[model samples]
Target chain A: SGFRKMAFPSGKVEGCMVQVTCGTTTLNGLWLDDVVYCPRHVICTSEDMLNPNYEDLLIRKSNHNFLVQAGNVQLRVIGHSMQNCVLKLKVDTANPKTPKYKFVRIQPGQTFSVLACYNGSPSGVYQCAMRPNFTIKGSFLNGSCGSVGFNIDYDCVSFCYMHHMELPTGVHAGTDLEGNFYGPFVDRQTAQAAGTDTTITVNVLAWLYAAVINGDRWFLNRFTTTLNDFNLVAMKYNYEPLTQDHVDILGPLSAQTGIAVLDMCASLKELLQNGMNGRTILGSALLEDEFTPFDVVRQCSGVT
Target chain B: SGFRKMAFPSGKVEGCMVQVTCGTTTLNGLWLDDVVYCPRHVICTSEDMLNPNYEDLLIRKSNHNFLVQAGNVQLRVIGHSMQNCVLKLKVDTANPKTPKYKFVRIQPGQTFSVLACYNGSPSGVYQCAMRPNFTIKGSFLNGSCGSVGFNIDYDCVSFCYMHHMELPTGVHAGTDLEGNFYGPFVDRQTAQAAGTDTTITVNVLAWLYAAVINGDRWFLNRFTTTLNDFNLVAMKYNYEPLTQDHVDILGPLSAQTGIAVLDMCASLKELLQNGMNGRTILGSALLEDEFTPFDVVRQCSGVT
Candidate 1:
């Protein structure tokens, strides 16, 4: 059978663990959802361990066709024509039946390479085509860019499945379906410097968790309450805690819901659990002390 | 020496009285200023009694040319040309020292009678020239249209002499140096319809009296406060008392300063005394209630 019941800190965990048959290694973790599953076998520090053709994939994707990089969503192209040329992409255009909504255009290009984000299509799709007349001379569809393969149940209208890019990764980590890799932020200073500070991270996770569970306005208010808490605490310190990194940590979720979520771990631990059923719902990881974005120990705390 | 001292309701008043020797009969009220003096001889029912040749004047003026009516600072000139004629009249242009202000223009015109208000030049003035191509087809340099020969002590910036036309008479009456003739209401309904309802009129006079006494912003605020009181009272009655005629009764003394005065006035007795004193300051006559805009003794009531 492909399923088993075990107990995680969250509760009697019954999440489907997909075994990744990546070459010789068969790794497993509490599969968050359909696309993102993790390593329960090894000391999994980095997600790159699960990257099947990981490095080679980025190399090939970067050098191959001017397509979206595996973990990223945007496409880059350089204009070779002497005059200005406009370019557009029709995602999943290979299927003539794809909805007419999947379209984007980059107006008159310059002499240099230009980058464009995948903003038009909210839902994830398969293919993209470049305009022929504009004839993309060269392009880089880099790694960690596109839609995160999580939450196939997400309805793109009221709530959207977030991408890896939304994570407050202090560095420009490649975005993938599971969202972006931000930490290994070993300390408060590093996270704060990277703008992925604990307070902001907590706020971001709260909103994301709320959205993932309810997908209603009630979910939206959760973020607000969490942020107000952060603000009250920070304001108590007379705003001495505010940093540039803390301010911009929520860029990836892209929506006001740029907080946290499950199957969305790889960031902080309790930050993830508090977002989902960890709050009032049992059998889920309740935000325990020392591991959450909030300082459960000090009444206002964070972790590495 | 045109001088007279007479006891009116307010007190014994000494004022300069100018006799406009209109033939054998002499008309006198109370002259307000150096140029706006009058006598106490005639029964001053309402200022409209001063309409005089006010009619023949506008008829002649309207038939005469394109120039502003008095108590006003704008000049108009019809385009008697075939091409686009840019026309402007620099009022009081004769005195290059009349401060760098006072101006008006008609961009283009026709065989049509055009109407425009004088929003620019505030003070009284004379002498306007049409631009190059359009020759002004004979104009009227009529009476009381320029600055009222009143407000002798007014700082032209904050306050200026008013004339009869500025009064909301509904009909175009003569612009006597004091502004305009508001009424010969002659009948109850007409006066009340004109918003000369007793209470509103008393309130109007009180504020006007306050402003006329002290032409400073303090007096201006007094009028604002009074009008706000009127508005509050009227609003309490859900504004059942507002009418177009009632709204603009103060002529151009403008602002909701449209309430009565004290340090100001009361009704008939005090209202009248304050008005006569106020108008004397304004070079105007007392508005005789029955002949004026209101029926002096009525309560907070009005008719159709």
Candidate 2:
């Protein structure tokens, strides 16, 4: 009979050591097949697909069967209890000699990808490595034979996934506000454009939200010093609806990517574009219509 | 002189009927013109656009209308009643006799595309059909004669309207986890990576939030079983400040094509690295000593 069966000569039980390998990639950690009751997991040494076995491993993963891949990371579920288990990926960069791994664990449901950064790369070459002997716990397998399946690919550029969906972060990079002190959107030049009479509150979190989503680091160093002391959430939450006064205050601060309307959208864009709050330059932009607070409150109510 | 006047020849009344058809795509339903008050929406039959019509059709929408491509199931709206109406798309495998249609409904907004999935193709294609017996609804028309503009082109991919804004669900997928058990990463993982052994809860909702936004399917199948036994709302509310611990727990669980970090910059390559929470990993990335949670918190507090 030319039938093939998955027979592991290493053990007679469902739990057995699995060699975690991806093509020629090598890692220096031993695989621990943890099968203690409910917490069934496989602890293994994970390395970078971009890193060689010669370097120090940054993370050690533990969980049941799951596989995920992306730019700089790939996790493969080598062994599993076929049930849900807790999973984790630990980092070890500070002390490579006696590396101390800082881990982030997740309960097992399925394998997913992650965006990660690695410091040591072999110039044009990349590799994945890990230290020896780490325990990967499982849901009920309360023993060392825990299940952990993980992998790391490499650091990817922003385009690898942009092909998937199209959406935008609501920030317009305005070149208009140069002379002002602002938050995330207050480029050195944009601040001056804002003038000294404005106290605009920048929506820094929104900028971060947009930055992390688009994976664009362009705004990373934009306004750290100028914005360090400002209150981001208070300005975002405690504002009145867009008014003619607010509109006048916002016009000169308009960025290149601002919206088409002069209502609340302009208020959000303008205030976020520069670094001033309404107290500074309350009467700026000249607009025909404005959105009252009631207007903002009415949109999200019941069916209206 | 033969002059045709633009007039409602049906009645001086408000209600008229509608018939929905797709060339060969068939459906068993009646169109109900819901004109009770204002915002009158004409409930019409929606179906696949792949239907054929050998009749007096004025326009033939090729790429702009029909796209039977992969990954990107694009749809466009060619004709409209200038009003609000329900829309849908149905699918069939290899049988017209035992036809099964999957419907995805969207409310009337400015024309935007929806991404759908249809395996490969067959030549003898059929499409959705509707009759002008349908009445379109409109805005500001408390009268039945309001504009009802409705049209749906078949599914298209990216070149489809991605030129929107940028934002992420907080995977770095933002979570402080107050309660509940959920996945592709649950507590068994979130806790240890959290370094808190309090039998602490994990936020499965952030996973849902991340999935619908990122369009990643990893978490979709990860939990239909164990997670179905839990609640989403109760879990999302009980969380602390968004820290690096939460970031680490979220790092590994990221899916392919996480949000592109900027507006109009949905680049896919710049994200998905490795595990860590918000605390220890804060300044490690050289992100201008980056954004501190305190820096983030101070902004949106009481009122500016």
Candidate 3:
């Protein structure tokens, strides 16, 4: 309630040296255990439910990014609002045209985060279409047109893992120049304010792998003192592993891999957000990573 | 095992009569209400899923043909699938990639039938993909190019008590004086063998109200002869009623419904064996059923 969360961008179960920040909002958060994991899916068609025509501009999905201290939590911000501030997050297991979805109010303003253990076994798409309004009138329809984003990128944990389980298109969302691209999606805008360096830097490690892979490895822990105030929160996720069957199996990705990552991102969006793929964009470039080419010699030897 | 079953199409409700009749397969006549009610779906996928190098085949899918009594069941076939056979299908619920498909077991030289009811509502685009591994395979590029169909068309069901879902592309397949032909899709040859049947009759209704103004309430009561013989099977489904702004609806079709009467004739494959778009010749010179007009109208409607 009063403490912040931590994150481990690196593929390690390090201590809470970094604070997992989701901003302060009166938003609610959730903790999904193995038995309680609800995938994020987008309700693509507002057909008649929202309107009579098929226009594209109908995208208004609110996402949930938070920090929890115990167990695990992953919820999609369906194209609607959870108003988790009201504690409403549930998943309907009965209907396909309609699945259960709701969440408890973790309280807005304060990012809600949880820690848990899980193995990313099921490799399927999980998206959500937020019907924020129980009784929506005139569903929105924005022609399938949106701003195209390019040259956006983000650095990742070297040798760590990234999973784009949903994208079916190429992942050409970023440039290898510095290895920082947001995605290969139609519309994507990053939230400004990526945290400032007001606190000191230190090495942190905790939790152990008991559940699955990443998240199963460790959980949340905060360490700050009056002498030094630093918010640190860490949560892990076990993304699907890419075998040689995909691209060349090296820490580096190929052009196709990039395209795949982009599509993966989109597919993942449809997989986890809304069931749609419009466009893709590469993000801001500022990182130390370039896809290492498929070193034929090393590849055969299984190296490089 | 303790549950007594029924034969749906056999006039004997013994258990579930999950059978599929492909080309070259002869089938025993099936009566309505004979077996358990089930919505059949065929599969379709990229040649790559089976081979690689096939991209155009990406959107390729499976097709199905089925039979049932007018008052047997209710269900929704979400993705794409060929109709003409009793089908239980699945759609790409996880991602927005090319709609992949999976089909239940069906044998060649056999006839499978069931009893299904409709929720007569409105009409819109329901999914229906081509068959995956048909009795035949056409060449395919990385996509759907370079390939000839199993020479089949996918069958989709639309809910509309007032209209039969017409193909935006218009029907074409069977060969006749008019290009408005359909075949391979429904196996016209098989239907002709039954007798006075002048041509193949596609029994499966495209959509309840999708076809034309002539297609409405009269569609119910088309197929009868309940099959409480083998085993009386009962399964109830919670239907979603069309709101005031409904996009489409499904309904029970019968002989009174023109194509509705196709049930009396056989499957879509049979209907197409002799007719096309309210015309008696499938894909022939007379009935081109081109998408031009439809395309123009859609563009005008901004829905193409």
Best by DockQ: 2
For all candidates in order, the CA lDDT equals: 0.22, 0.19, 0.19
Off by over 4 Å in 1: A1-94, A100-193, A198-230, A234-304, B1-304
Q: For model 3, what is the alpha-carbon lDDT of residue B70?
A: 22
Query: What proportion of the real contacts between chains A and B does each prediction keep?
Result: 0.00, 0.00, 0.00
Candidate closer to the true structure by lDDT (higher is better), 2 or 3: 2
Best to worst by DockQ, what's the order? Answer: 2, 3, 1
The segments of candidate 3 whose C-alpha lies over 4 angstroms from its true place after superposition are A1-304, B1-182, B186-304
Between candidates 1 and 2, the DockQ winner? 2
Report the number of the highest-TM-score candidate: 2
DockQ of each: 0.00, 0.02, 0.01
| CAPRI grade of model 2 | incorrect
Better of 2 and 3 by DockQ: 2
